[PDB]
Design a protein around this motif. Structure first.
Motif, PDB file in Angstrom:
ATOM      1  N   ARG A  14      68.715  41.381  66.315  1.00 54.89           N
ATOM      2  CA  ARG A  14      68.006  40.295  65.636  1.00 54.89           C
ATOM      3  C   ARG A  14      66.551  40.666  65.409  1.00 54.89           C
ATOM      4  O   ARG A  14      66.030  40.527  64.294  1.00 54.89           O
ATOM      5  N   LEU A  17      66.271  43.286  62.598  1.00 56.45           N
ATOM      6  CA  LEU A  17      66.535  42.774  61.254  1.00 56.45           C
ATOM      7  C   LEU A  17      65.417  41.857  60.765  1.00 56.45           C
ATOM      8  O   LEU A  17      65.096  41.845  59.575  1.00 56.45           O
ATOM      9  N   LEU A  18      64.823  41.071  61.657  1.00 59.03           N
ATOM     10  CA  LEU A  18      63.793  40.134  61.231  1.00 59.03           C
ATOM     11  C   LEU A  18      62.393  40.734  61.304  1.00 59.03           C
ATOM     12  O   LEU A  18      61.431  40.060  60.927  1.00 59.03           O
ATOM     13  N   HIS A  52      57.449  34.252  61.575  1.00 58.73           N
ATOM     14  CA  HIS A  52      57.945  32.962  62.033  1.00 58.73           C
ATOM     15  C   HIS A  52      57.190  32.591  63.293  1.00 58.73           C
ATOM     16  O   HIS A  52      57.147  33.369  64.250  1.00 58.73           O
TER      17      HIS A  52
ATOM     18  N   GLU B  45      75.590  33.865  61.307  1.00 58.88           N
ATOM     19  CA  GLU B  45      74.229  34.170  61.745  1.00 58.88           C
ATOM     20  C   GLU B  45      73.889  35.633  61.454  1.00 58.88           C
ATOM     21  O   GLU B  45      72.838  35.949  60.877  1.00 58.88           O
ATOM     22  N   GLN B  46      74.820  36.530  61.787  1.00 54.72           N
ATOM     23  CA  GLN B  46      74.642  37.949  61.499  1.00 54.72           C
ATOM     24  C   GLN B  46      74.465  38.201  60.007  1.00 54.72           C
ATOM     25  O   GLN B  46      73.597  38.983  59.602  1.00 54.72           O
ATOM     26  N   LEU B  49      71.065  37.038  58.896  1.00 54.60           N
ATOM     27  CA  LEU B  49      70.027  37.942  59.379  1.00 54.60           C
ATOM     28  C   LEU B  49      69.974  39.205  58.537  1.00 54.60           C
ATOM     29  O   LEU B  49      68.892  39.762  58.297  1.00 54.60           O
ATOM     30  N   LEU B  53      66.891  36.593  56.717  1.00 51.82           N
ATOM     31  CA  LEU B  53      66.662  35.162  56.862  1.00 51.82           C
ATOM     32  C   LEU B  53      66.752  34.789  58.332  1.00 51.82           C
ATOM     33  O   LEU B  53      67.636  35.275  59.048  1.00 51.82           O
ATOM     34  N   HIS B  54      65.823  33.937  58.783  1.00 52.82           N
ATOM     35  CA  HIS B  54      65.900  33.391  60.126  1.00 52.82           C
ATOM     36  C   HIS B  54      67.052  32.404  60.182  1.00 52.82           C
ATOM     37  O   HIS B  54      67.116  31.469  59.371  1.00 52.82           O
ATOM     38  N   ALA B  55      67.988  32.667  61.090  1.00 49.97           N
ATOM     39  CA  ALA B  55      69.133  31.825  61.381  1.00 49.97           C
ATOM     40  C   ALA B  55      69.329  31.845  62.886  1.00 49.97           C
ATOM     41  O   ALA B  55      69.084  32.872  63.523  1.00 49.97           O
ATOM     42  N   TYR B  56      69.740  30.710  63.458  1.00 49.80           N
ATOM     43  CA  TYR B  56      69.892  30.662  64.906  1.00 49.80           C
ATOM     44  C   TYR B  56      71.059  29.769  65.280  1.00 49.80           C
ATOM     45  O   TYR B  56      71.150  28.622  64.835  1.00 49.80           O
ATOM     46  N   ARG B  57      71.918  30.283  66.137  1.00 47.97           N
ATOM     47  CA  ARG B  57      73.098  29.558  66.575  1.00 47.97           C
ATOM     48  C   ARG B  57      72.779  28.733  67.822  1.00 47.97           C
ATOM     49  O   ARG B  57      72.237  29.256  68.805  1.00 47.97           O
ATOM     50  N   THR B  97      64.135  27.665  59.598  1.00 42.03           N
ATOM     51  CA  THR B  97      65.247  28.443  60.131  1.00 42.03           C
ATOM     52  C   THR B  97      66.555  27.758  59.762  1.00 42.03           C
ATOM     53  O   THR B  97      66.635  26.527  59.751  1.00 42.03           O
TER      54      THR B  97
END
Ligand SMILES: Nc1ncnc2c1ncn2[C@@H]1O[C@H](COP(=O)(O)OP(=O)(O)O)[C@@H](O)[C@H]1O
Ligand SMILES: Nc1ncnc2c1ncn2[C@@H]1O[C@H](COP(=O)(O)OP(=O)(O)O)[C@@H](O)[C@H]1O
Lengths: 197, 199
Positions: A14, A17-18, A52, B45-46, B49, B53-57, B97
């Protein structure tokens, strides 16, 4: 063109990638010391760097997630506990989490820190002492809170503030302006690999 | 030499979204145990990403024994569990997010309360309810943790407690008909079709 491995993304995946690592920037200090003023300015600065960053304070916590909590001793402990967990979640999402609560008790701040430092993969917990003298915050008193002294158990007046002994960052807001406080915090993040150059 | 700029007060929502090139939202998965919420959530989510892009589970792994470790299994605890998850998912959406929740969330009223947190927010936040829909026969065949076989476990959604299915959600995915990649494709396409991520 959709690709994924089984299971959850790892933290390193993560972060890579970010292009960013998550952490918690934990502000503590007396009322009117400048936690909120510094947090909103720092958040904007980091967002301008395409990072972020997210501020947690009374405005978005007190009447939402923690609206069930009162002002008794047990409520106050639980308030900080939950803010600690939420701040960790933001750090796990590769976000710079900035908390802006007085957080007067050493024990409460220590438990928030241990959630980060004991996490399976350790997450940086950067405690920032926003340090202004009582004479300075009483002269500032932007909400009249110090003058009321009609208000009970007030941190620094009728309740204790437990200053951090040796935090990661110590900022005296009577000698540094807001931009300088943002510069100090951001430079610490950069020098410790938490934000890009 | 420094390079710092900011206006007084907090960043506005539009400022944050524009600076980060992304709009926040909540993708609320709901469905029976073993329907495929967690499997789809981690793949989605993967995928996001990979799009930078910010994504969060949000699921049991990072909520149950942390923020909500004080909660038990009585009905009041259960309501409070979803309530808090609704608030935390809103905070993530406010941070620009894509927040993806993967809880059974069996009761309509609980999902509705989470929804109204978003839709009645000062600046409205999209709440994308995704029915992960698999027949009782399929999830009993899956049963990857033996939970359906235990019947040993009390008040279990779909066996000994109710699941209240969404009437007309924003997205409805039948996971006995679509694979995981196709489920991710549908949700991601919905996000792009509604302007929440770049095309
Ligand atoms: N260097 C500084 N950093 C932050 N605030 C400052 C500084 N110098 C003066 N101030 C003033 O002190 C007050 C701090 O208020 P606030 O940010 O609400 O404090 P807190 O959140 O700690 O209660 C503001 O009016 C701010 O303009
Ligand atoms: N099309 C599909 N979508 C999602 N999961 C599927 C699908 N087909 C089979 N499965 C399997 O079903 C199980 C779903 O488990 P899980 O994701 O834990 O469900 P839940 O989170 O709803 O309890 C996994 O073993 C997964 O590999």
């Amino acid at each position: 063109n959709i690709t994924f491995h089984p299971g959850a993304v790892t933290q390193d995946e993560r972060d890579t990638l970010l292009g960013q690592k998550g952490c918690t920037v934990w502000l503590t200090g007396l009322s009117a010391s400048g936690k909120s003023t510094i947090a909103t300015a720092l958040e904007q600065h980091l967002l301008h760097k395409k990072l972020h960053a997210y501020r947690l304070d009374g405005d978005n916590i007190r009447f939402g997630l923690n609206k069930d909590l009162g002002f008794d001793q047990a409520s106050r402990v639980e308030n900080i506990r939950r803010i600690g967990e939420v701040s960790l979640l933001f750090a796990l999402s590769s976000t710079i989490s900035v908390t802006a609560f007085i957080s007067p008790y050493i024990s409460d701040r220590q438990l928030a820190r241990e959630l980060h430092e004991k996490h399976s993969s350790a997450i940086p917990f950067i405690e920032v002492f926003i340090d202004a003298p009582l004479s300075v915050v009483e002269q500032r008193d932007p909400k009249g809170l110090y003058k009321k002294a009609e208000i009970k158990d007030f941190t620094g007046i009728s309740a204790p503030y437990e200053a951090p002994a040796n935090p990661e960052i110590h900022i005296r807001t009577d000698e540094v302006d807001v931009a300088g406080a943002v510069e100090i915090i951001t430079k610490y993040l950069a020098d410790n690999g938490l934000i890009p150059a």
